[PDB]
């Protein structure tokens, strides 16, 4: 067996040599972290590290007490509460007087709750519910306030103001789009007519529908047309909710819009976060329920809204609270639905507009062959047709190139039922 046998052992030793080579290599890596502009940072670096001045634990207020009327002395007092401003200033049968207030009860991120004092930098106007506050390593007492929650900087990303979307980038001039105009623009221009009729002007809308219709494109479309600044929150992209973190997510952006005038508060994708609670379910959550309870009251409070409109897109109306579905929160309801022939013509024309293709194509001709469909599928026919076109080595996709692309999606539909029909001869 000498031709392969001898050469087998030789193969083997090389592989083992290669394994050994990799363990020699990885035991030494690239030197070190030393950088000349941060060697000057070292001068300050020795002093602070050895000193008692970091780390500060992150805590956050979860319960507010007022530090007199609290019931701290319990000598000749009664209940769990005092006079709500005095408890030791009206009596010295306690044998004590104290003039400490706004003491506050924090929660650590280890889930351990403590009452703390106030520093030399703190006054009751620097602290609030839900605001991060730094406390000591050992014996605790607030040193410096940190801004509320982890929400700032992460929210601003989701918010885009003044969209670069109009009703050219939406195909179809659909029924829902005509009822959409009436909600935002019409009472903003003239709140006079609504007042005289004796209806209270529409300002709530819930856009809902199957996926892929483009409920969002429209919503953006009118935001630009009404020429209002746009504030977006997406409650399934932003998943901060833990112990009323998402109520702080809601509050900020609503609060910001309220300071401005001519605004759109678009609450998006609230199937989770500010949506259905899962107490009833097996999830046990009621963390999204704080987000819900806040959202309602912000609306209700804002009213009359001074022509600043609160909009809603949610995929399902099954994930909403029936308090939202009372008027004065949502007033108008639009289900987005499959576009008509020409509506599907238009979504094809925009996709095709971006392409560099032969112009002899007719948009109506393609969409005839197409069935009733979602916009997202018509995005797929153009991207698929593009791929067929380069493969055949045309720099154009002919009318014929889009008919092959349509057909493959349909053929799949046929595979899941039964193939072959009477339309091969009719």
């Amino acid at each position: 067996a000498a031709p392969y046998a001898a050469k087998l052992k030789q193969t083997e030793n090389d592989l083992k040599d290669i394994e050994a080579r990799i363990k020699e290599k990885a035991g030494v890596k690239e030197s070190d972290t030393g950088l000349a502009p941060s060697h000057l940072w070292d001068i300050m670096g020795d002093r602070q590290r050895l000193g008692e001045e970091h780390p500060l634990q992150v805590a956050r207020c979860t319960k507010i007490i007022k530090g007199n009327g609290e019931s701290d002395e319990t000598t000749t007092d009664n209940n769990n509460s005092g006079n709500s401003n005095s408890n030791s200033n009206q009596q010295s049968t306690d044998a004590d007087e104290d003039d400490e207030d706004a003491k506050y009860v924090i929660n650590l991120k280890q889930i351990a709750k403590f009452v703390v004092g106030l520093g030399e930098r703190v006054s009751p106007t620097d602290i609030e519910e839900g605001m991060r506050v730094g406390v000591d390593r050992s014996k605790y007492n607030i040193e410096l306030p940190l801004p509320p929650r982890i929400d700032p900087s992460v929210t601003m990303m989701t918010v885009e103001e003044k969209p670069d979307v109009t009703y050219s980038d939406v195909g179809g001039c659909k029924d829902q789009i005509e009822k959409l105009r009436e909600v935002v623009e019409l009472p903003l221009l003239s709140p006079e007519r609504f007042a005289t009729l004796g209806i209270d002007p529409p300002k709530g809308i819930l856009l809902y529908g199957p996926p892929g219709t483009g409920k969002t494109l429209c919503a953006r479309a009118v935001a630009n047309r009404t020429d209002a600044t746009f504030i977006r929150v997406i409650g399934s992209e932003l998943v901060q909710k833990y112990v009323g973190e998402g109520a702080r997510m809601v509050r900020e952006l609503f609060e910001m819009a309220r300071t401005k005038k001519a605004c759109i508060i678009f609450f998006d994708e609230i199937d989770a976060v500010g949506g259905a609670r899962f107490d009833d379910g097996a999830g046990g959550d009621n963390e999204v329920q704080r987000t819900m309870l806040e959202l309602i009251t912000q609306l209700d409070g804002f009213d009359p809204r001074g022509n600043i409109k609160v909009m809603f897109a949610t995929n399902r109306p099954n994930t909403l609270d029936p308090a939202l579905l009372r008027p004065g929160r949502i007033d108008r309801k639009v289900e987005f639905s499959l576009p008509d022939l020409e509506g599907r013509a238009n979504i094809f024309r925009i996709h095709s507009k971006s392409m560099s293709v032969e112009r002899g194509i007719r948009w109506e001709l393609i969409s005839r062959l197409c069935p009733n469909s979602t916009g997202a599928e018509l995005r797929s026919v153009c991207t698929e047709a593009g791929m067929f076109a380069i493969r055949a080595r045309r720099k154009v996709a002919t009318e014929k190139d889009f008919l092959k692309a349509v057909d493959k999606v349909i053929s799949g539909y046929k595979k899941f039922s039964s193939t072959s029909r009477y339309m091969q001869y009719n």
């Binding site: 090389d14 972290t33 030393g34 940072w41 670096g45 650590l108 560099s356 791929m387 799949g412």
Partner: protein, 385 residues
């Protein structure tokens, strides 16, 4: 004999030299410098205590501090100081803390974690440029979507279209969907991520959404890349348990996956691959077309396709003069590509059974009847007859 010697001529001398070269150089690196860099290192070691508690950087506040969440139960406002920069850090990157008083003393990780280790692989692909025949067409559809933007982006720009993002391989077991993805990855010479979608899920709660983030985070650092999340079915619509101990975990984990795939941008530079048994083990909408192009349905080899698979196997085994290539096909009826490989393993065991060193006629014939018997139905021709 002569050419396996030629493989030995190329590999032995170049490889053996490479080990030896590394080994001397580790000494040699040291010798050029004897101050400056040595000094800076020396004081880095005085500053950084032993041990170092790991951190994870949540966010940077621009004032020479930051907030970390650490495997120590309470969070910390730490400072950024000593041999680290404000811009040497990015959020969500893993940092090294000082045991005594938590401070970011630098990074030597940069997204170094065990879930990263499972995911990255230095292994050799099993197939290279479709070693095993059959499914000629289906690979010229993966390639259009996945390989083709990486190799030539220019062609899509003349066309004026956006370039595809991702593919979904699905349908039949034993058709080597998981092996075509490995083939395509070797052809390009891309970065391959064998992570499995089922390796994010455990009983213990709240760990999972971190893991989903880390995949997209690492994939983008080493881009171009091909990401294969194999077996995303298990994390589908279904539930962990009907009692407890998992009511949350699947729900958070899936949702979190769709989000950071879309949130990149609509890229044609980090492709994803979802390998799944069906769309009936997942949610009815994924994320959901125009965005996930293209979908590839695997079905059973036809007579042409299963010939091709077979010819590969039979030639690597003794004899084929005994029973014609055609006579194997004829006897077989249409089945997945595993059933074709199965007949050949059984054939080889049968040559052992006889104690032959040839795959004889008798061996082929039995091995064909065996597989057909597993895997059987007869009411196709019983309804009929």
């Amino acid at each position: 004999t002569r050419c396996k010697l030629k493989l030995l001529r190329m590999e032995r001398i170049k490889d053996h030299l490479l080990l030896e070269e590394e080994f001397v150089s580790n000494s040699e690196i040291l010798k050029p410098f004897e101050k400056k860099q040595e000094e800076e290192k020396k004081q880095l070691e005085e500053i950084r205590g032993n041990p170092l508690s790991i951190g994870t950087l949540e966010e940077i506040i621009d004032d020479d501090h930051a907030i970390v969440t650490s495997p120590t139960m309470p969070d910390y406002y730490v400072s950024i100081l000593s041999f680290v920069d404000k811009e040497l850090l990015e959020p969500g990157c893993s940092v090294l803390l000082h045991h005594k008083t938590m401070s970011i003393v630098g990074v030597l990780q940069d997204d170094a974690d065990p879930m990263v280790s499972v995911m990255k692989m230095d292994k050799s692909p099993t197939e290279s440029y479709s070693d095993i025949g059959g499914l000629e067409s289906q690979i010229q559809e993966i390639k259009e979507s996945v390989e083709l933007p990486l190799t030539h982006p220019e062609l899509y720009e003349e066309m004026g279209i956006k370039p595809p993002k991702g593919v979904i391989l699905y349908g039949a077991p034993g058709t080597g969907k998981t092996l075509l993805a490995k083939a395509v990855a070797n052809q390009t010479s891309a970065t391959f991520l064998r992570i499995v979608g089922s390796e994010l899920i455990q009983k213990y709660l709240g760990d999972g959404p971190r893991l989903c983030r880390q995949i997209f985070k690492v994939a983008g650092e080493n881009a171009p890349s091909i990401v294969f999340i194999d077996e995303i079915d298990a994390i589908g619509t279904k539930r962990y348990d009907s009692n407890s101990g998992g009511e949350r975990e699947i729900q958070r984990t899936m949702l979190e996956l769709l989000n950071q795939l879309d949130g990149f941008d609509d890229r044609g530079d980090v492709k994803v691959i979802m390998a799944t048994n069906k769309i009936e083990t997942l949610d009815p909408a994924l994320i959901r077309p125009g965005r996930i192009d293209r979908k590839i349905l695997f079905e059973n080899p036809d007579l042409s396709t299963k010939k091709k698979i077979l010819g590969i196997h039979t030639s690597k085994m003794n004899l084929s003069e005994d029973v014609n290539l055609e006579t194997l096909v004829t006897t077989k009826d249409d089945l997945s590509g595993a059933d074709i490989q199965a007949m050949c393993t059984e054939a080889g065991l049968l040559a052992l059974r006889e104690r032959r060193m040839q795959v004889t006629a008798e061996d082929f014939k039995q091995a064909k009847e065996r597989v057909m018997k597993n895997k059987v139905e007869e009411n196709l021709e019983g309804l009929y007859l």
